[PDB]
Design a protein around this ligand. Structure first.
Ligand code: HEC
Ligand code: HEC
Ligand code: HEC
Ligand code: HEC
Lengths: 86, 85, 86, 85
């Protein structure tokens, strides 16, 4: 509910650069084309958290998000991938 | 197709759908230029093929939650009518 | 000069749907991804005019542009393809 | 790289260039998410490789007209410094 609104906001607004600009994710109405479609990947929380934290390939590692924000966007993505809002 | 049903189908394809079909798909009639999904002017699906994709989802396309059945029938008819013109 | 401003405006604003939404063309700062990069294709005036007039593949045929507007966007594209503004 | 030269390189990559490099290219440092051209965080070009592309154009990438040589050197240094971080 509220932990979802948070991840959504990180995915769309707080992240730098924003996840939504690089990634596709229907729940967020995000259609970024730079990296993989997250509705296709359907990653678990750990996989997201690791990717955001360390970076991977040409994806940059996080600098501005706190650890709890990284967890919240990891939880969010892993829960909503493949599905639309509510 | 009567002008009011076409107007209905356009509104669903462009705005009512969640996410909006036009966010992901191209369809010249609606001036939709989505890229993530297939170009519907290329696909030229029939009404049943559209109805099934929207109702059930397909691959990374999400299943509909917001539209009613009548609204799904409406957009299916719309897309199958105008795709490729 | 003025015949170029015209083609540019047709390419960006007057066309329905707009050429710029489907096509990439540097002079217009257009980065549409639906059809081919026109800076890559570098078509002659005839090839553009025919495509706009008749449509081709999933590209729709024109309905709203007058014949002189079709000529102007054909002239424009064929002159500027591969190059940036002035 | 001093903060003012980085600020210069960002401004050129994002706004001064014509068209804007960020319109076509991805570069995380600039929050650029262009798709038409290659991802520069993947390419990780050196300064000479950037200078040559911008000066001469390459494939469907147009040659620079607007930037001065100093401005081309600046953006080349910028991209080669930050590409991949
Ligand atoms: C471009 C400037 C991006 C930013 C902003 C975000 N992501 Fe990303 N991501 C991007 C690329 C090019 C890749 C592919 C990496 C590779 O070379 O394989 C990714 C990858 C991911 C993944 C999958 C990682 C894996 O284990 O395979 C995930 C789950 C992911 N990215 C999520 C994600 C999040 C939550 C972002 C906001 C903090 C984010 N990405 C931003 C490109 C870019
Ligand atoms: C991104 C979040 C999408 C939205 C929103 C809509 N569609 Fe979609 N669609 C999308 C993808 C990635 C695909 C490919 C599916 C696959 O893996 O093959 C599709 C596909 C379709 C199709 C073709 C289905 C088939 O039988 O092959 C149709 C007819 C279609 N989509 C229609 C459609 C409608 C009506 C939408 C709004 C209700 C809509 N799509 C939204 C991506 C996305
Ligand atoms: C999508 C909704 C588009 C609109 C709007 C415009 N174009 Fe297009 N164009 C599009 C596609 C998908 C294609 C490929 C056709 C194929 O199947 O091969 C094209 C093609 C062209 C071409 C090349 C034609 C050829 O001879 O190979 C040109 C020169 C071209 N289009 C120009 C053009 C102009 C001027 C437009 C505005 C009036 C325009 N296109 C709009 C997709 C779409
Ligand atoms: C679209 C109109 C572009 C703009 C604006 C810029 N670039 Fe670009 N770039 C573009 C394409 C399609 C390509 C691929 C070229 C090819 O055919 O291989 C490129 C390539 C580059 C490269 C790599 C060059 C190489 O040696 O392979 C670099 C380093 C590069 N571009 C940098 C760059 C800069 C600094 C820009 C602003 C001055 C810029 N590009 C704009 C497309 C477009």
């Amino acid at each position: 509910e509220d932990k979802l609104a948070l991840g959504r906001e990180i995915f769309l607004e707080r992240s730098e650069p924003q996840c939504a600009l690089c990634h596709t994710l229907a729940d967020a109405e995000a259609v970024g084309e730079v990296g993989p479609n997250l509705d296709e990947l359907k990653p678990d929380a750990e996989r997201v958290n690791t990717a955001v934290t360390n970076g991977i390939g040409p994806m940059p590692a996080n600098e501005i998000l706190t650890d709890e924000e990284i967890e919240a966007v990891a939880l969010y993505v892993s829960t909503v991938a493949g599905k639309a809002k509510n």
